[PDB]
């Protein structure tokens, strides 16, 4: 007898539902929704009680945690699933894990966990394995089955982002390792408890495979609390309203979700084909990236082109043909995490007032060719900072959707896209409590947002993976890091220029304090801004590093000398460096490093990125430029050159607009633009000559060569566009850099008894 | 009659009083508020209330055992953003932290849908603008250790800058000052020296002297409110206390605080009472709900200046540490509520460029609008729209004690709103009321949706003087289980103050840290430390009851403590199973009681005894009995109102149609009676509007139930 | 429906916060497109009919006499047929040196041009900036949007397709 | 009731034996050896059968392996323990693990594995954790308890040197990592099976945390074979000569 209510096995049950979905185009073959249509009051009561239950689990259980990432920032999520692993309802927070935890349940279904090790009432499962779909090892899942009268009726999943999982690098978004081996403690749907009790062998093992043991332990109690709160609530709801009504809701709620997406697409968008692209940098050639494998030492660029098709019937399709390959770094992903993040974006723009569950995934088609960085075909890849690539590819999809909104007149919904979510301040050693420790600041939960067609973006406000941004309190971060704040400041000239300006980021200056045997490192975009401005707007600023060693600050503080405080207001004209004549200063574009020794009184700049702009800056309201200069959002010298606005400082110290001189400056810039530009054909002729001569850096050539091999349609497009002869070729081997993994790869599904679940065309 | 309990709701347009006798019978008084000295309107309200029992103020005040004050004067400064002009001194290099709002202030007070819908996010302007903010060079760490000694010259220059910028108050907040206040208090003393040399009157507020708790964003906002919103009310309580003592009272005034319990009128930290009035309302709702069996209540209240909302779920108010309110993170423990600047006195203005209609956030308050000829108000308000549309009776505002002229409202709306928009006067006023109804509806819906519920899970209670004027509009189509207007709506917050337990409470922080298993000596020492705090807090409680004429043998004591697992950022309040603690076994009993409560609050599997325990605070409460207000229980008569309940008709405009609305005297209607809209049900201090398409029925508890037809 | 005035205020970036929140948080008004295009039409210095807005100052229009559809700037300049990529007929300025990047970003905050360039696309008559691309060296010019105008008008809006040669 | 024969818990049993060792200077307080002195023929028979059993387990089970390290070189060992985790007899081969596997059993004793996760007849434990005494992660232990009439009477341990455990460096004696983090898949006395059957969650996880998956899999079957061969032989010896002897 199978364990699902009615007697089907887990696999029999899911297979029946997926076959009906495929045959009819509706989730589970539901052509009508009987409970919703015939019993609307009861449908709404189940919705209300269960949505309030999952929201309450997140709000209440987070108060268990010692880590401010969970307790203050709210980087956790609880989700209710039907027996087939499809989500019905979720809390807010890190809701990418609606998809990752469901995909872990589906792995158990598809690999016969029912027969061994068994799925029993009061069992506890733990999982974080990125080979079956998770973002990275630091997002730990606890999964509990829900039973009614001895049969399985659903599951509950809870996730917390933990500080570290014992990777080579000390942090959550770690560098140092280049493979799975050293990428952190990885758990594959492990049974870690029974009869509501955690097993001692699990407790002892897990706790010694991480640096931040006490924080790890309280994050685990956080997840189990919320799971058990939700299980209890489901039991009460079933007791009160009857299993028949709940059983109907558990599938109808998903189809209701799909219907909601389809209707919103037809109400808000325009049918057609939309084309866009994103990139980001991997500067691993630099000497301060000390990786232990010589085949990883090279500079590469991530490539993510997307062809988006919105159909007349309200379906849509996203095709990533042309994307670059996985690599020897911690930025690789998986089809589940990649597509779940697109679903997260949808929740912020298309479906925020519909059912928030897996229905919208069933209403979207995805094509991710096998072997690209978003659908890798090698079981050795590392994932600790998956986001570097992920957030850099998703930003372009906002621009495509915004063209539909703009064309139709829904200007309020336009958004030029998400910021790159970085820098990640990281490090490890001994803390102020004389214990082994690691840090991972969530200040980059609060980055700039994209400008709209109606108003400026928000500064220091959000991240693509959680729109409820929070930078945390300085006094709370100081309890969890052996560091003290010397500044917290809005980041001038970080927001992307435009008619409407993208949100600025912010920055904090840290001094090392009460640390011992300490190291730190940087992780974020450097040479490349991933976001682009829209319809004439510009990208946000890109990243850089500032750190200072042997500062002599103890003596400078004691003697009354000037000391660095605040932000690095103008990094081209810095003030801090001259205050530290004896220091070793690193000030450069190397925004990715591996761990380096730091001591008390050393300095580290944490810089959070801005978001992209909207429209021609020459159309910005002149008073808004003056307000931005007065408010610290824009440096004075860019008013004239970028916006054509003439400002002057009044008697009160405030900048004001010269309206006559501004009109003349803008008329003159229009003429300058015509004089300095060339017809696009003429520019194309010269760029084509460089392509024919192979005149670009190795990082540019490697990106095209790898993309061509995985994406023949893209190679054909490129050759046609540039009118290249058949005698021109770009083999990766002729570049002179290592190419390990370009031809030979071995997928996880090649190992014995492994059955992978397919979610996309590949 | 032997009159024993007085509750108050001041600072609105009208000051309300609520008196309870030895049998639980009650009466409600009203009078016009007097913001230059609240005591004057409070005395007049008291005389009006007691006249319903044929009693004088002299007779009753002698008999009263306790009195509880609440009001909205401070809250009104917050929601209108009309406060004392404060400057701010923080650490040099961190001047921006306040205006950044920790990011979180861009999405506070939002529905589930708006939390995720990114383009809805928005920052309101800061309490203190950047040009009124300065920084001193200093750093103290989380242990209290000086990293960077205070540079005193930078404190002097900061002070002189804010004085020259015409600051009317100065707030100081330095990092970890709650742990070691030495540097923050020296900056305070230096600021005080520079103020003295200037000759100006500029009060100074150091965070460590008022709200010494961790989280600079929360603490700094709260300390700002002490200057911005509380300081102009600093003398109100002592004026009230003196006016009442002159007239024969023997009790010591209590005031409703943020956490739903009362404190002394002598409290130094006035922002603890910033939402006294709305909290009184919630306590009232919880009490009424307990008597009649309502477990899930959405509270809603409109006055002259604010709209206040709160949720009671499964019979409990939910007290939150480090809460938010009015889109500000705060350090005051708070029953879950929120408030916005929209009320019956809100000014109506046209945008000079777009001609968009803008409501508030500022209000005429006690001055009403252009319709009150003696007010001197020139700008139209929502009350002027009520006059045009027939929502309120010009001849029965405060029972007829304040004369309103509808023609003045007609003329002013015509000149300011209707002619510039090309509208008739009645369409301009109706359009304003459409905007208000929709704004209030969305605000109430958002509070419910932020907790994940739908309105169908709740009953709505609608109260305050102006609540029943718009109940039809702000609940329309939301699907509440029921919608209820108490007949005593105008005095509902004063009712709640009277229904509060007669309780005093004092707290003290502690730092007891204990491994899972320790020898008996360590447990004895931990117990003695907690016991010493309980003995000190017991004196504070008993001294307060002594001032009210109660000796120690009349007071019931309930000790408490705050406990957590070691390393946690949050604690739980536990009621002690022991009256005192001495032995190792006593300590084990206190740790067992914590583990059991933690299991109920969270889950059994969440307990982590292997980490050990920290006690972070001690609590003592004391209680004495008083009569509660008796909720009416009368038997139902027929469906048809008596003919003598009808008091005429009035022209009434909504959805582009004039109708003759039937007027009723509220107090003449009987249990069982049904009234079909269009109708207006009028009392002397509230008005219940029932448009065409709505119906109401009155129960035996003097509660109206509102329905769409 | 929203009033014509509120949609005017939306287009101008002057809309009030209450109306903006209502527009975001409640189901969309189906009438938006027809009102939006009428407001834009009234502002143009030519009488050719707008078929679809592509940007603040960029449109697919129907030519008054020939009835061909072209991509047009607000100033009147026609780039090309509506199915072609307007950028291939525009003027371009490419920031591919550190000096050129430093005109618009501070040093260190600027992208590095051997990894990413900035490509600015202008109308050849008035110098309006209609798009900025930010790809690698060698990257094709992007054809941003091919709208299904027939499908949009007939099936989603329920309007006939405008005349086309 | 404790699980050791006679009713002591594992910890009660070991603590009694260690205290008598300390007080007398003789293992377990044994001042005389009654079986050896009074029944020398039976003492020798048990020695002969059990030593031949452990030798035979190594010689036979190594033929399962794909890795030449195990199959040809013989870098494996099987060892028989009393209830307190002290070894009685062993095969030859990599006999440093006589001590490491006994110390792993003693860690289970001292940390109350008896109460959670429990020590049950037909359970399978796996271990390689150097923090509790092992040489390095590439020496993997399989440990099985031995029961007689419902009570624990001993344990059997089997070890194989495996090719790799997924450290930063590709090899057994790897360089590249400088700490535990990156030093290989590390298992702390994990219960990996029950009713003589390996758990699927263990199988899927373990197999993807190493490079040499197929070689890993056959080294595991090698260890379980020898452990179960020895368990069966102990049951036969007890049936034939009696539990008291
Ligand atoms: N008969 C009445 N007299 C005075 N105020 C009334 C009456 N009926 C309704 N109200 C409302 O009560 C409000 C005062 O509320 P509050 O500020 O709480 O005193 C006024 O602004 C009126 O809109
Ligand atoms: Mg030229
Ligand atoms: Mg397979
Ligand atoms: Mg009032
Ligand atoms: Mg009120
Ligand atoms: Mg609103
Ligand atoms: Mg809340
Ligand atoms: Mn994470
Ligand atoms: Mn070995
Ligand atoms: Zn032009």
Residue numbers in the entry:
A (entry chain D): 15 to 776
B (entry chain E): 9 to 717
C (entry chain F): 2 to 166
D (entry chain A): 15 to 259
Copy the relevant paper text.
ACs contain metal ions but not organic cofactors, and use ATP to activate substrates through phosphorylation. The first structural rationale for acetone carboxylation is presented here, focusing on the 360 kDa (αβγ)2 heterohexameric AC from Xanthobacter autotrophicus in the ligand-free, AMP-bound, and acetate coordinated states. Like many carboxylases, AC is a heteromultimeric enzyme complex. Its architecture consists of two heterotrimeric αβγ subunits joined by the interacting α-subunits to form a dimeric core.
To examine the proposed ligand exchange mechanism at the Mn catalytic site, the acetate/AMP-bound structure of AC was characterized. Acetate was used as a product analog because of the instability of the native product acetoacetate in aqueous solution. In this structure, acetate is bound at the Mn site and α-Glu89 resumes its position oriented away from the Mn. The collapse of this channel is apparent in the acetate/AMP-bound structure, which shows a reorganized Mn-proximal α-helix in addition to movement of α-Glu89. Such collapse would prevent the diffusion of intermediates away from the Mn. (d) Our acetate/AMP bound structure describes two intermediates or possibly the acetoacetate product electrostatically displacing Glu89, which results in the formation of the Mn-proximal α-helix. This switch triggers the closing of the interior channel and the reopening of the substrate channel for nucleotide departure and new access.
